[PDB]
Symmetry: none
Subunit: 132 residues, 3 copies
């Protein structure tokens, strides 16, 4: 895991499986902007707003939503998935992204979106950097 | 460029990502016959019926279908991919064919399958000729 | 036919255009070591680990990567290029290596990296040997 310098993330999406009442739109947009800033400092810029950002409920929504993403957004590079703690959703994310569709997926715990820290944003960058 | 003489396309497939309701079997068979004729006349004959011809929908279908093709038809030379206009399918077809599986692919817009003209068939032949030549 | 004696391959690189998911690090390291062994037995020893070993994707990556290689690794003798099969990358590799930069490049199919046999390693040795011998 030597860090890669050449990465640019142009097309990406957010799928929020945490409840909106806990993880609101402002929490998500705040999170997005802070993630963009750190990714820029590290020389793996996330350009742009996500091309898609929706709430969803249930592990069974993962495959349909990811197929939808792949089928709708040309060149989609990354899906960031927000999770409400321990969940069957995580398992469903992993199999679909890593073994079915071959698309980079990164999960994040809702609590790190509600109150973001540079350390957790850094962790997410490093993981994305490895994946991409 | 230079056109290449002496190419023969013996094993080829059609993957149609345009909806069947717009691009029916008879449209595809008619298209195939016209392509056969012009390619023969130009001395790069696309010989025979395709070894495979199936509909699919979505960029997500590309990799599974092409893995199937690669694994089932040894000596597959070409996949002709019919596209429904602007689509994430094109990008995925190029990624899978050129990078993932290593398979020659030529895309064609559905509107040129629904009504063929000599000029669009010629375009397609020349592209195939360059790719396989 | 005409195998060349007395060649030593000291500076060489691997550029893998097959996806990592298909052609993993262990596949590449295993392939490298097997290639070194047979090439040593045949008297064209690969003296070291490659100076560079990276994944890349797309014909558009070829020229930049090869320029990097040429400019960074003095006396680079060989680039081994792993390809998934028929691909516009093959054409671009030949154009850039043979006409743009002038460095010896040898392509190999991903399936022969994933699982080696003595016969396919031998094939690749002979081709490397031919390209490197000369004035
Ligand atoms: C089991 C479980 C785990 N997590 C954590 O969230 C992502 C983080 O790490 P990750 O898996 O993303 O780490 P990674 O090495 O990049 O590998 P994968 O993401 O491909 O699995 C993981 O530790 C949850 O939030 N909920 C859960 O229920
Ligand atoms: C860039 C782009 C192009 N097209 C056009 O539709 C078929 C035609 O095919 P093309 O002659 O380009 O040949 P192709 O097999 O697409 O591949 P190349 O070998 O030219 O790269 C291509 O120009 C799309 O439908 N979507 C796109 O996003
Ligand atoms: C489909 C495919 C096949 N092969 C075969 O494997 C050895 C030999 O090698 P190739 O003649 O293709 O290429 P090469 O030695 O670098 O030769 P030159 O182009 O310098 O003559 C070629 O017959 C590839 O290597 N790459 C492929 O993708």
């Amino acid at each position: 895991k030597q860090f890669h310098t050449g990465i640019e993330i142009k097309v990406w999406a957010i799928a929020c499986f945490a409840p909106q009442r806990q993880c609101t739109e402002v929490h998500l947009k705040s999170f997005t902007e802070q993630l963009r800033k750190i990714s820029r400092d590290a020389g793996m810029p996330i350009q742009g707003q996500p091309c898609f950002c929706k709430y969803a409920q249930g592990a069974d929504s993962v495959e349909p939503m990811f197929r939808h993403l792949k089928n709708t957004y040309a060149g989609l590079q990354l899906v960031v998935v927000i999770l409400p703690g321990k969940t069957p959703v995580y398992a469903e994310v992993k199999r679909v992204g890593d073994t079915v569709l071959g698309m980079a997926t990164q999960c994040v715990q809702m609590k790190n979106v509600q109150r973001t820290t540079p350390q957790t944003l850094s962790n997410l960058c490093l993981k994305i950097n490895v994946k991409l």
